[PDB]
Ligand SMILES: *C(=O)[C@@H](NC(=O)[C@H](N)c1ccccc1)[C@@H]1N[C@@H](C(=O)O)C(C)(C)S1
């Protein structure tokens with residue numbers, strides 16, 4: 001086998017690598033180093049979700065966002081509640097929801113007599129996985145994969161930090177966002193400036209308290225944040241849209257937990273599963289992965305879906321196909337949880353199942369391609385021949401973690417599946433951009449060795 | 454050296470162990486397996502904090518909780534504001550605060566004419582470490598180590614779920630706590646129950662919503678909750694205590710966020726450092742660790758202390774004594790953060806520092822003693838001869854993590870220091886009772902080899 005031990009000499013001191021690789025044609029393991037150690041898979045976890053979704057949802061699967069009502073239309077009035085049904089569409093734009101509501105106009109509803117009711121019942125319990133880190137929850141990459149999801153459940157604020165030390169930075173929220181940003185951030189001089197933290201503390205109803213400081217900067221810029229209460233956000237946006245459409249409403253917003261009985265007025269459908277999976281796999285969209293993860297449970301068990309139900313469903317589905325998990329922990333579909341524990345060999349068995357069943361699953365085309373697209377279009381260790389345009393791989397990255405899982409063609413045109421998990425990688429401290437050079441060098445050498453072996 | 458690698462065969466598949474030990478009398482390393490690999494130390498991290506606290510705070514250090522004003526007292530009136538200064542005391546009880554406020558009434562004050570002003574300026578930025586897991590933040594073990602801390606910033610509620618399927622569980626909060634617990638949790642039948650989640654959602658101002666369902670219970674279901682807004686909680690306690698003391702107050706509660714000057718009326722002192730360190734080390738008190746961590750930085754740098762300053766101070770203080778951290782990540786004093794990264798050998802160098810300076814530090818007596826006290830009085834791997842009454846060790850545990858760091862006497866009467874980090878330990882799914890038999894056997898074997906080597 002490849003001497004993976006010698007290769008990890010170039011990784012930073014303290015790090016730990018789990019590396020396993022198999023020549024599928026020869027049915028031979030050609031690298032095996034901590035292949036059985038549980039590690040943090042980060043976003044390589046999305047491979048499991050991709051397979052489960054293919055199998056339990058199918059290529060015709062679409063997320064539906066619907067408008068329903070129990071009552072009768074007449075005189076331009078909807079004589080009852082407007083029910084808005086959200087099922088976790090992670091790719092729903094504000095533009096789409098608007099056209100959806102526009103459908104009420106087209107049917108001559110001039111005004112709604114009753115209350116606005118949101119049906120988010122297909123998801124159950126929290127909209128965050130267990131073991132997610134609290135301070136990342138305001139970052140847009142970590143926006144909640146909730147039933148209601150509008151423009152990725154992210155917003156930005158406009159900041160102007162062009163000021164002398166001690167002065168207050170100006171923060172405005174653009175008029176489209178029903179959010180508050182409150183508190184005060186000051187400009188720090190270049191001394192204290194390397195120390196700066198911007199603190200964001202969440203309060204109810206999408207009110208974000210900022211504190212701390214920032215280094216002077218000349219030009220305005222935007223900071224993005226995740227929406228926290230996605231039901232209030234969604235309801236506030238629908239009410240503004242109804243006004244814009246000139247449909248009249250003066251009811252309250254209700255948020256029941258149970259499916260809402262009704263007559264269907266209109267429906268919007270997302271792109272189907274193959275397009276969602278491709279964006280999830282190429283760009284590594286956390287929210288698509290966690291929505292599919294629970295959509296899989298919802299459809300598979302026919303009951304409202306918690307992340308725990310997602311875990312049960314994904315394992316049960318892949319187990320049906322011969323995959324064995326032992327005591328792996330799969331707390332989410334995106335890989336964000338710090339409780340996830342998976343060994344390289346388990347990820348590898350899934351990659352083999354993917355390559356074996358490619359005629360059916362067509363998942364190979366979803367993987368980023370070295371030097372070409374997705375999250376590895378510029379990956380340093382992969383950017384030269386013989387690896388460029390040859391290595392395809394799902395990436396996973398968290399603080400301390402640099403992973404790759406996928407396939408390549410060796411110098412004999414045989415296929416090699418491989419999993420690389422690197423954890424404990426640290427070359428400065430909390431809030432030091434990480435020196436990636438030893439990683440570029442490890443990966444360049446590793447994939448060349450698997451190429452020639 | 455000891456063949457640690459064979460001994461890990463008894464640990465669950467997937468787990469990883471970092472073990473290192475030294476015979477101090479011979480100065481020989483006798484076990485060294487993954488000794489340089491960064492791992493999660495969990496509460497063994499508190500060893501670093503004990504040493505930094507001894508060096509920078511000293512045995513006379515006590516936390517101060519104080520009452521100040523600028524008005525003068527005339528004719529039974531405090532003619533200005535009551536300032537209550539909190540500095541992070543992690544062992545302040547509401548009875549102690551009550552006796553402190555009683556002192557006003559011994560100085561003749563029976564009415565306060567102004568406002569209640571809290572000064573919590575000694576600590577700054579969040580009261581939570583970065584990399585803490587969001588869903589544990591409502592649990593009493595994860596109560597915020599804030600400036601204001603009353604009864605461990607934890608309270609108790611009871612759910613009476615001894616009722617039929619379909620009924621709403623009754624929530625009872627004892628009346629001493631100025632908090633609200635509300636929601637509709639229902640009792641689920643035997644069929645639905647395995648799918649239930651009992652959730653809590655935190656709302657502004659210490660309002661807790663419980664949601665979900667649970668199986669019929671056949672005793673009272675206790676909830677133990679962390680206080681989320683510690684300033685509001687403290688101000689509410691103060692106002693009820695003032696009332697109960699017959700001191701009239703009708704002013705506002707102000708939280709200015711900067712140091713508040715005034716004349717000192719009365720000062721409550723905690724128990725001194727050696728008592729705080731003994732409780733932190735014997736029992737593993739998370740709040741005393743994170744309190745001391747930031748008190749250390751406040752006193753060492755003389756400026757409001759965040760967790761980042763805590764990290765800088767602890768490293769700087771120990772670096773002076775010859776400890777080298779390289780690229781370790783210490784995000785807190787308690788080890789709760791999932792970003793913490795430290796190698797067995799760095800912890801061992803601190804243990805050696807501890808044994809070498811025992812005549813001045815007196816920290817040896819703060820470690821738990823196998824089969825005798827603290828968190829290893831009943832630790833199954835250590836409770837037989839020759840380990841019982843001989844091994845002393847600080848424990849660390851999180852989901853997946855089972856650590857010891859401490860000392861023992863071997864068969865020759867020489868002192869051995871050791872560090873055992875186990876991560877990736879999984880014997881079932883997330884919410885499962887973990888199986889400890891593999892841990893008991895691995896530890897019984899490892900400490901026996903270290904005894905015999
Ligand atoms: C999977 O690993 C995901 N990672 C994250 O969301 C991290 N929390 C993160 C790391 C760095 C920057 C922003 C978020 C997604 N996958 C990553 C990857 O494929 O390498 C990502 C950085 C593109 S986000």
Ligand SMILES: *C(=O)[C@@H](NC(=O)[C@H](N)c1ccccc1)[C@@H]1N[C@@H](C(=O)O)C(C)(C)S1
Nearest residue numbers: 495496497594737739828848849850851852
């Ligand atoms: C340090 O390791 C601390 N651990 C925790 O607070 C964990 N979050 C936890 C694990 C299990 C149950 C409750 C909390 C403290 N140290 C532990 C130890 O010494 O083993 C602890 C369980 C006593 S709490």
